[PDB]
Amino acid sequence: NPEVPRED
Amino acid sequence: RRQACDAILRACNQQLTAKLACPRHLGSLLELAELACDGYLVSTPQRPPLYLERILFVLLRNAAAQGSPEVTLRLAQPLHACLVQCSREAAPQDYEAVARGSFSLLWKGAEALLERRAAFAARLKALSFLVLLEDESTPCEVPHFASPTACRAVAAHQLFDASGHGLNEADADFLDDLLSRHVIRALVGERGSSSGLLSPQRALCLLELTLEHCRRFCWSRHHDKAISAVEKAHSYLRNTNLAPSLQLCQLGVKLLQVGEEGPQAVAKLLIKASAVLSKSMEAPSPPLRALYESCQFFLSGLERGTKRRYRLDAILSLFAFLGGYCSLLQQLRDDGVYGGSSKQQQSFLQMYFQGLHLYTVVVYDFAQGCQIVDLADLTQLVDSCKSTVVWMLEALEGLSGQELTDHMGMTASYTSNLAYSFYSHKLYAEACAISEPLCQHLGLVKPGTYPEVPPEKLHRCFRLQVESLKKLGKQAQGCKMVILWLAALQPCSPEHMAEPVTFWVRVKMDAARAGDKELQLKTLRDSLSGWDPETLALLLREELQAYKAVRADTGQERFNIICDLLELSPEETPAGAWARATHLVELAQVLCYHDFTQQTNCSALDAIREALQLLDSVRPEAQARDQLLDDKAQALLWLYICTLEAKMQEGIERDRRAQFLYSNIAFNLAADAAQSKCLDQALALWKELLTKGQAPAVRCLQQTAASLQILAALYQLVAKPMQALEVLLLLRIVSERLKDHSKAAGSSCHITQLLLTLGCPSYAQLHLEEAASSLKHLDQTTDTYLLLSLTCDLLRSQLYWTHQKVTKGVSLLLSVLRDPALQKSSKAWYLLRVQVLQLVAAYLSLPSNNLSHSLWEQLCAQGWQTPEIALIDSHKLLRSIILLLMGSDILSTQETSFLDYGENLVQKWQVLSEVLSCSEKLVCHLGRLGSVSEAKAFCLEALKLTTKLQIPRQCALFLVLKGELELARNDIDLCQSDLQQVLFLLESCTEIPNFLSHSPTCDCSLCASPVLTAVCLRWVLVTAGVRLAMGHQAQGLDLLQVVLKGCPEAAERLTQALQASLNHKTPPSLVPSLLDEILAQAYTLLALEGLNQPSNESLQKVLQSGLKFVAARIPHLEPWRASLLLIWALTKLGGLSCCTTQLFASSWGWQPPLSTLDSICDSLSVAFRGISHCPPSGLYAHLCRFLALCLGHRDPYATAFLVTESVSITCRHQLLTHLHRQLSKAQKHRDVPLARIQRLFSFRALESGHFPQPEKESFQERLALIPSGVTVCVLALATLQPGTVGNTLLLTRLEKDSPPVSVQIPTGQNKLHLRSVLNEFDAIQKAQKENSSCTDKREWWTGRLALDHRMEVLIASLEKSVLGCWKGLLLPSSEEPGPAQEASRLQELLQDCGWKYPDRTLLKIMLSGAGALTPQDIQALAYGLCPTQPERAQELLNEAVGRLQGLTVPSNSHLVLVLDKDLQKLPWESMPSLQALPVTRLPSFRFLLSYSIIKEYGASPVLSQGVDPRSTFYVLNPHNNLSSTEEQFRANFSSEAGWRGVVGEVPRPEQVQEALTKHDLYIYAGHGAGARFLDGQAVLRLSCRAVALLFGSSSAALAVHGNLEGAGIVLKYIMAGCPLFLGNLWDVTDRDIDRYTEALLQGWLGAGPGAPLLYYVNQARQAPRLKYLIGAAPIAYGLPVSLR
């Protein structure tokens, strides 16, 4: 499952 | 008998009458006739019918015909006795012919004989007969004495000594002998007949004679004889009607005889003196003339005795006599005998005024000599003073003509001197009373009756009263007296009316300040009602001018005055139209800077437009053409001002509503040129007025000068400096015509400053001398003098700076800086300080060779260390002035009135212009230094300011600067957009661009303006840069050729324009230098392309052309000279590619397994000395690393210093600026650690010497400062072509008490070079970003796994293919003594195999890691170190490592990695050799020394004590984007003991500030680095006590844009003092970084006290599923940190 990046 | 003898005598008289050839015979016959006369006398001396007397008279006539006075005197010798015996009466005219005619004969005889003594004695006997029968003679006139007999005696004294200085004792006796025995005896008579006293006529003669004798004797220094003479008359003074006369004469003769004695003496005689006069007038028939003549003598005693010998009682005693004397004179005036012939009556009045003239003089004498205790005496004299003025005005009653005019003239003087005395000794109340009767008479008199009394006398008499009333508190009565002052001068010119008008406004303004409004209610119109309309209008205009002169708030007063004036002026008449237009211009000003439209229904623009139309409809006469010019010019100027004010207010609301870069189109319209046309027309009118030789006929030239000042300031704001120059020249002309030397000096100073800004120092020098000349006519106590002298000193300092006289210029600048007057709290002083700061920056931008070391310390000791600091302080002061003048609306749009009082108007536009100029300087300097972000901040602020004002020219300038900055950032799209905006502004200001292909001699807007020409050339430069960045070569080169052509051509146009404007004969000696920075930059860019294209021969000669240009202008274009020298050195090195041996090889002791170099070192040393003081980052780094390469191991310390000084230069500049801000607030609140850090990061803290001796000494001290146990390794890339990435690694190992060790590692020779590694890293990041978006889970995971494997391969390559054998330089040193001994042994044996530069320290360092020294590492080392005989060296090395293996163990220590902008990206900490070691990163070595300083003074609490685990602040899931992170971390974070923080909310900026300043740990488990709630500025404004554990994406990364040093938030944390900063080098995914964070926190916190964070950082690195893609991301910045 794709993980969201820790960015804005 | 006797009759017969008389008949014979008559015949003898005829015989004696003949004076022919026988005159001696006739004289002999006359002698016989005298005997015959004696014989006749025996019978009868004189016939009863006086026949003998008639015969004697005939004989006397015969003697007169024959000129025989002596014979006649003998003949008439017994006549007095014969007349005395004659008695009877009826003496005829013949009696006079024989007696008075004898005196007449004697008068002719006196006119004959040269001598006087004998002749005067004969005349005295003749005088005894001249008026002998005067008992019934007619009275004499009254310019003379009482009787003719005494008048004769005075006449003889006239022939005597006329000077009357002294009388000889013998002369006094001889002179007395004549009158006493001949004249006095005859009048007295031997038969005195005591029964019959002297007859009335006889008595008057007797006293008159005594006075004349005493007056002549006393005046001619003789008093003793007169004392006896008075006694003789006093002897016969039994009783008489003229008795008082001689008693008063006795007192007079006494007074001169007493002379200077005890004080009471003067009073005692004066006391008796009053009694004699007073009682005599009481008599029913007083001797009027007797008292009069006698009193005049007594007055002389005082007038000759007026030697300041006066007391209080003397003056009152004088007033007693003075008053009685006045009664006598007016009483004589009553008598009408002299009333008919006013000739004598006028003499009586002159005597009255002489009597009063004495009183005024005596009082002024007393007044001057008065002390505090004496003021009581001065007060008692008031009532006496009051009566004096009353008598004088009463005396004038009836006088007409010059008698009226003159005698009014005294009464004005006499009261004025009396009032001045009281005004002088602080007696205001009494002064008004003395001048009141005169003041009211002068006002009430029908205007014109007194048309000749000097205006000054009237002005003085009135001024004393108005001032006295003003200071007592009587402001109400003062205004009425002012009207009386104007009333008296009703028939007078307007010039005299100025002073009453000035006093009116002052009295009313003080009244208003006192709180009174009733006085304010009254205006001149109502009080002056009854005067003619024209004079009332003139007075109202003067009152308006006086109101415009005063400061503070006067808007509504001027509005009321303008309303009254407009009502008075009749609009139906053209003259009324002109007056209405002028008053409408005044109303336009008032409505322009106030809000009274609620009372007029008219705006400022409507009023000024109606004024302009009315003025256009005025056809003037022959004269009045000048006044019309002035009025129309002022109207045009104020129309411009009001339009600009409306535009500014509309812009304020535009921003307020919006609260851009879209309004740029709104700026430049046809309205811009239409608006500037008004200023052009005003200038044309003023030039036409003030150029012609004749002095202008304007009502107010001061207003013309002030308007000229306002026009010049507006022209500089709109960026039209030549027009401002013309206006300043006109101001100089006006100031010369107005005799104002302050204005002349200020104007000349402004011209000098303008000429210096343009770049022409000669014309500037000429204007500085005119200013110095004008300054010598001013009171040196005035602040204007001090200001102008300090300004002239600054201008002379700047001229010395320009003409390379730096030593004396620095001395002058230090004298100005140290002057206490520069710190005075006034707006003009603030404006002076700004130019001081700019000149300080000018001196601070100079190379160290220009000035001595001592003067450099003296200049830096003032407070500013870098030019940027001085410029920033100047900008801050300018903003403060703007705030103090016009609020904050023009600067920010988040209420104070403008308060226009003349100076504020000029200062407003001046300060706006200086803000824009200082912004330009700051932007240029900061962009040149490589600090693009700050420059962009200033550029945006200036663009906003020019947006509000709507000035297209300044907008174009700042848009070009912004385009240059965006090119520096490598942002091509935004730069192109800015350039296109510039193109539109330029094309619509003049109405491939069209301003190119213009004639060299062109007169268009873009060619007649230096500013627009500069903007065009900068545009071409930035466009060429864009073209070259986009790969379009030979187009950017074409544009650079255009720039090269354009700059010298434009300089000549400016030269010609300046010469034609100032009308100098010779041209400026040297062409101005303002486009020389543009030409130098073009030269630099063209030479750098020649480097890229070595074949183009054209570019090859450009390096020599540019170097000669920059060498001709030392030291002003030094940074460009340094760049050109670097390019020359690179050209001489040869091919910059191919990775050959390179000339540097000989200078290095290891190779991968005069001379040209001497010349290169010299050139590079010169360039380094050029830029060492204030270096641009990239150029400095290039020079430093190239010179380190060239120097090699020929000088280890120079190489290490050069490598150290090439890293993080922009951070050094920013730290210096930040430190200055900290010290400034420290001074404001109220520093030693701050001073030491300034001295550590400073560029000028060097001693004098030759390169590199002072640099090496500074480096040696900084190396002595290193702490123990720390290893500093600098990894820099040596770039052999600017704008590229080098493949040579410079490695410097710095340690305490060990010599520096350096090494060069060329990586181009091998595959997997440094460029390949960086390219692979960037590709990995790109692929990660692409994969993040994908939605298919399997593809996402597979791509992530591939990226992790790529990261592992890159990390392995870093250790094996880049550092190779030198990896051991980063490892700690051994404490065991084995490696030192082995190095000592091997050094000599290695030197015998060909080791060129034997270094024991390098051998020690490499032998410490003996265990991990692979056989291949040994082979590389031995083969590259001893190339002559490699195998023997390999054997020796293998033997040494065999002896050292196992027997050595690494120790506790710390590795600080200093990396450049390109290498900081790579994850060096994850290399397999560095996995088990504690490693952190610092921006530079000076930062490690700074950390040591802060820790010594106890400012870093966590680096001194430790991290408290209970002082943590966490920001979790602030934006509600991540639900998994919250679920994982919420329970752990909240259950932690003592931890506070937030979740699900953006923490208020106040919360993060307290977190960073008051806690020891800060954890951000969110997106990015948290720049949304805490930006770099906020963290920079605070001191960071806590350890920042930032777990976002790219938190520790530095962004490299173009060729600029990396920027980021971590740098701000380090500069704030963060003990340690943990962050992600690249972007991460949520769950993996969650596992890393959990592992790190659990491992560190569970460890307990004394737990190094770095150990658990590398252990937490093994937690994620993606080991290298996520674990390798976190890095540390700072120094190691533990738990307490």
Ligand SMILES: [Zn+2]
């Ligand atoms: Zn042109």
